[PDB]
From a paper:
SARS-CoV-2 Mpro is 306 residues in length corresponding to residues 3264–3569 within the large polyproteins pp1a or pp1ab (generated by a ribosomal frameshift during translation). Mpro cleavage of pp1a and pp1ab at the 11 sites, including autoprocessing sites at its own N- and C-termini, releases nonstructural proteins (nsp) 4–16.
Further, a product complex of the same substrate, captured at 2.0 Å resolution using a Cys145Ala mutation, is also presented, providing further mechanistic and atomic information to inform future therapeutic design. Possible explanations for this, which future studies may unravel, include allosteric communication between the two active sites within the dimer upon substrate binding or, alternatively, a substrate-induced dimerization. Capture of a well-ordered product complex in the catalytically impaired SARS-CoV-2 Mpro C145A mutant is clearly defined in the electron density maps. For the C145A mutant product-like complex, the C-terminus binds in the same extended manner, forming analogous main chain and side chain interactions. Well-ordered electron density unambiguously confirms the alanine mutation and presence of terminating main chain carboxylate oxygens. One oxygen of the terminating carboxylate sits coincident with that of the carbonyl of the thioester acyl-enzyme intermediate structure, forming hydrogen bonded interactions with the oxyanion hole main chain nitrogens of 2.9 and 3.0 Å.
Numbering used by the authors:
A (entry chain B), B (entry chain A): 1 to 306
């Protein structure tokens, strides 16, 4: 028993972290097979960030300008190319520690683990959610770019995020492993602002099901609702709309607990309109939106009577 | 910027997890050098589990009764002995993945990362605190016994916890790596109950310093306080008394932020008496006590590990 924000074991990803240096700029790279992936702003100086012409800066650099280090070993760069906002450095050696992996682009609301790194070395691991405004509420300092977000499926590592930068509100922006930013952000020093952040409704519902499994049922009511009706109320409280794919995803929890998804939507609707009145849910005064239905399922391990 | 419950990278510990089977009982073991450490209740059956005579059960078992597996490889057990509540199985092979390690006994208030395992395989990693009542508020299911807790400093893994069981309130009990339980608990099915839990004051102060570093400063006040005056208020809110050793421990953060410890104590005193009035600290409506002063330094300075 017990629920916790759990990250995946980081071992498979730690064996892929390298340090990439270009001039005086150092950040983290990801060594998979004979390729090192890293943010393209490694080729920039502080002055270049004001409006960098990346094609032009890359053209002026050669393989010898990249210093890739994997511990006390230098990796010889054989080729280099840019794919969107990521730099790919072909090295002469294939990483012997390369796990089974794939690159995936995640949707807002989905979670992943972050292995925060500095100088090619891991500092810590934590669980994050991709926000509806395409930012992440992470913990990153200068030198953390190149750090990746991932999930593990059996023994396959799915890389879904590479860190690039921090927005003025203290949230983080990055790309998938194909170099494409999540959201409307650019790797240029300009005034950028994240859109209005919204609550991940499907995860609040999953968390209300976790509370029901753990014995917290004060918020439950004998009422039901209709999908569009709920979405109109939720929209007013800055909650994301609940799609039919979200309802399908909540199916296993709904079946186990015997509480239909739309009955839980009516309980959430009452909570939004009346508040919690000093009461808590799972030892929390606020509704949690970074705990997915999958986490609730795998941590409960309950049976579904039919 | 940002502040998260951050676990240590688990890679070094993943290379030490093995599966230990004795009869029909299977749990996790810790393979360091030529020794496998695991809870002694692996030698028990469901019937033994009420009031087991461990000495007698161990006496009636031989090395051939233990099946130790490290992936698709069986490890030969050469010897076996009991040290308090842990079984030590000497194997014929030294773990080639043994990191630099030491066994430590931690104090209440201290945090560590838990690598939750099932059948010798890591499932997830999270950060825990040893509560003042010697329980941990973890996330464990049947088969998680033998999962360990650890901290890292420089390149040395300090193992401080091995999981054994769950108490009737849903909290968890375990031992240090010398087999001694944290708290007044025993490894059998008897009436056991955790004592009254309290808030780890020195950790709440460490977390208020983390908030200040991240620019969340609304709670700061012009008032200062005396130590006994603070303890007289904190005691009423079920907070642990702040000792002079705690003030000394908060010294580096106090110097790093320019805010005296007793100045922060007066801010906490106001927060306890008036509440947060709808405001949050580091996105939290409740005061967090599972970050020590070094957990804050480690994260906000970007300390990395081997």
């Amino acid at each position: 028993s017990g629920f916790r924000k759990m990250a995946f074991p980081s071992g498979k990803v730690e064996g892929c972290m390298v340090q990439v240096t270009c001039g005086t700029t150092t950040l983290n790279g990801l060594w998979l097979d004979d390729v090192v992936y890293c943010p393209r702003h490694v080729i920039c100086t502080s002055e270049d960030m004001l409006n960098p012409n990346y094609e032009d800066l890359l053209i002026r650099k050669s393989n010898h300008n990249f210093l890739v280090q994997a511990g006390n070993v230098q990796l010889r760069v054989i080729g280099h190319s840019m794919q969107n906002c990521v730099l790919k450095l072909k090295v002469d050696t294939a990483n012997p520690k390369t796990p089974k992996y794939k690159f995936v682009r995640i949707q807002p609301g989905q979670t992943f683990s972050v292995l925060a790194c500095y100088n090619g070395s891991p500092s810590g691991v934590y669980q994050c959610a991709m926000r509806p405004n395409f930012t992440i509420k992470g913990s990153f300092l200068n030198g953390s770019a190149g750090s990746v977000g991932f999930n593990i499926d059996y023994d396959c590592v799915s890389f879904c995020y590479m860190h690039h930068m921090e927005l003025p509100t203290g949230v983080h922006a990055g790309t998938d492993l194909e170099g494409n930013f999540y959201g409307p952000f650019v790797d240029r020093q300009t005034a950028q602002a994240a859109g209005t952040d919204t609550t991940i409704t499907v995860n609040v519902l999953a968390w209300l099901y976790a509370a029901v499994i753990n014995g917290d049922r004060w918020f439950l009511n004998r009422f039901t609702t209709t999908l569009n009706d709920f979405n109109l109320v939720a929209m007013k409280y800055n909650y994301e709309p609940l799609t039919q794919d979200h309802v399908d995803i909540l199916g296993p929890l709904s079946a186990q607990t015997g509480i239909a998804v739309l009955d839980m939507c009516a309980s959430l609707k009452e909570l939004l309109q009346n508040g919690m009145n000093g009461r808590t849910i799972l030892g929390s005064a606020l509704l949690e939106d970074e705990f997915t239905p999958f986490d609730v399922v795998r941590q409960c391990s309950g049976v579904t009577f039919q």
